[PDB]
Amino acid sequence: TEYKLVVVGADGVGKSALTIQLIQNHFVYDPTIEDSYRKQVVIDGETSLLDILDTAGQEEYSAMRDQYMRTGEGFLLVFAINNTKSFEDIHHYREQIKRVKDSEDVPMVLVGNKSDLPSRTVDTKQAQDLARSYGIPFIETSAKTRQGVDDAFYTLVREIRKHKEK
Ligand SMILES: C#Cc1c(F)ccc2cc(O)cc(-c3ncc4c(N5C[C@H]6CC[C@@H](C5)N6C(=O)C[C@](C)(CC5CCOCC5)C(=O)O)nc(OC[C@@]56CCCN5C[C@H](F)C6)nc4c3F)c12
Ligand SMILES: Nc1nc2c(ncn2[C@@H]2O[C@H](COP(=O)(O)OP(=O)(O)O)[C@@H](O)[C@H]2O)c(=O)[nH]1
Ligand SMILES: [Mg+2]
Secondary structure (H helix, E strand, O other): OEEEEEEEOOOOOOHHHHHHHHHHOOOOOOOOOOEEEEEEEEEOOEEEEEEEEEOOOOOOOOHHHHHHHHOOOEEEEEEEOOOHHHHHOHHHHHHHHHHHHOOOOOOEEEEEEOOOOOOOOOOHHHHHHHHHHHOOOEEEOOOOOOOOHHHHHHHHHHHHHHHHHO
16 A cells, blocks of 8 residues: 655745654755655554655646646645744645646645744644635644654545545
């Protein structure tokens, strides 16, 4: 069993740091580099391979990019709790996913990262309300302390399994 997971969101939210915590178990990363990793995990008793695409690069839209994004089975929509503009951008990323997947119910999880920082600008309640409006889970994370990291990825695999049952 394999799951193709894609991590999206604004520059500097922690996409690479969350990916590296899951894959390499340490808190680290060249902001311009887009790369993929695999990890074998057991989630709710099921062994699976997670393929994680950590997105980066210039904002560009093309047939090849719409094709690389379309292969994602589930998406983490990551914002940083100290960056209001990254939270405001979440609607854009959710819309792009829905556009390339040609579907209204693509597996997604809303992730509020940098939960260890004291300089919060986005309240937990604003994020919970946004996730409820989308019908998706909201997970608070810190790539620095590892709070919520496995929960964000594993919850996205559970969202994919629920979608496969429909
Ligand atoms: C995600 C997607 C997507 C899906 F999910 C699903 C399907 C897709 C299909 C595609 O064809 C295409 C995409 C898709 N690719 C890329 C996107 C993107 N990138 C990509 C990443 C994320 C932000 C920035 C630019 N990125 C960076 O890596 C920025 C840095 C690290 C900055 C460096 C540069 C050197 O100097 C120091 C800083 C960089 O290397 O350029 N930015 C935006 O939007 C940004 C906002 C803010 C400004 C205006 N713009 C419109 C809204 F207002 C939001 N969207 C993107 C996008 F949709 C999708
Ligand atoms: N304190 C703290 N810093 C983080 C956390 N996640 C990422 N960072 C830092 O924020 C910056 C951007 O992180 P990065 O992973 O490159 O973001 P990306 O551009 O979304 O890939 C780096 O300096 C990271 O070390 C976190 O949860 N807490
Ligand atoms: Mg990165």
